[PDB]
């Protein structure tokens, strides 16, 4: 039962909280 709510973590995205290193991933995604 994820298809709809998949990939959104209860303790992070759902609470508008980011983990300690996700910034590192998002900053690595350059060209668009």
């Amino acid at each position: 039962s994820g298809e709809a709510d998949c990939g959104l973590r209860p303790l992070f995205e759902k609470k508008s909280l980011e983990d300690k290193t996700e910034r590192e991933l998002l900053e690595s995604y350059i060209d668009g």
Binding site: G2, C6, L8, P10, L11, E13, L25, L26, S28
Partner: protein, 247 residues
């Protein structure tokens, strides 16, 4: 995982750990993609050279775990397997092409703050994020000796030509490699024990986490200058759907 840092509670709620029933031993990582389906690597279940050919009843999985050594009362859940499905074209004697397998839980697991499925990538997310330099994430326990809590490492996807020259095995488009250059601009990595675990990336577009790959073959935590390989999940998405839709 080697040269990683401590993960935070509930940071990888889709993380699944595969165990041998008897004697009890941690075998591989895996990922929760629905309340009853788990994704992992085929070599975690089938590898003839090492006399490995597990059946449903030889295994069990633990979900929602953070600490490897201590039991997390009312948090972690254990489940038996109803069925195991290995990709028919999985090549264990050569390059581990199509190194993927699905496991159906006997009983659906209840989602919680610690147990939640990861998304399977769609075409746009795959085309958009699967680029050299872009970082994905792998989590697993230390066998750095061992760990207390779950470890995390962020690794950059490698240029295909560089991946090809890093190994003498014939790579296919159904796999990609990730990791930092041996000269050290950084140096974390997945290990043998993280085999089967997910390689995830966060879409800046919709804020969701997608499993882009499956940790492939590894021995210990040393790849002698090489890069770890990952099964390309999007390319094998129709197979996953075929299996789930029928069984």
């Amino acid at each position: 995982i080697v040269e990683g840092s401590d993960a935070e509670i509930g940071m990888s709620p889709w993380q699944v750990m595969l165990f041998r029933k008897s004697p009890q031993e941690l075998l591989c990582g895996a990922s929760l993609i629905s309340d009853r389906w788990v994704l992992t690597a085929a070599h975690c279940l089938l590898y003839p050279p090492w006399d490995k050919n597990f059946t449903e009843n030889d295994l069990l999985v633990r979900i929602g775990k953070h600490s490897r050594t201590r039991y997390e009362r009312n948090i972690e859940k254990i489940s038996m397997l109803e069925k195991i499905y290995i990709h028919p074209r999985y090549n264990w004697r050569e390059n581990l092409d199509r190194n993927i397998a699905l496991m159906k839980l006997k009983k659906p697991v209840a989602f919680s703050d610690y147990i939640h499925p990861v998304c399977l990538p769609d075409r746009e997310t795959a085309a958009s994020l699967l680029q050299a330099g872009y970082k994905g994430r792998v989590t697993g326990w230390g066998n750095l000796g061992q760990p207390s809590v779950l470890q995390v490492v962020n690794l950059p996807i490698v240029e295909r030509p560089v991946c090809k020259d890093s190994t003498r095995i014939r790579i296919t488009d159904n796999m990609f490699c990730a990791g930092y250059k041996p000269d050290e601009g950084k140096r974390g990595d997945a290990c043998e024990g993280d085999s089967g675990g997910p390689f995830v990336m966060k879409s800046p577009f919709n804020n969701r986490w997608y499993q882009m790959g499956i940790v492939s073959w590894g021995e210990g935590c040393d790849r002698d200058g090489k890069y770890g390989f990952y099964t390309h999940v999007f390319r094998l998405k129709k197979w996953i759907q075929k299996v789930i839709d029928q069984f």
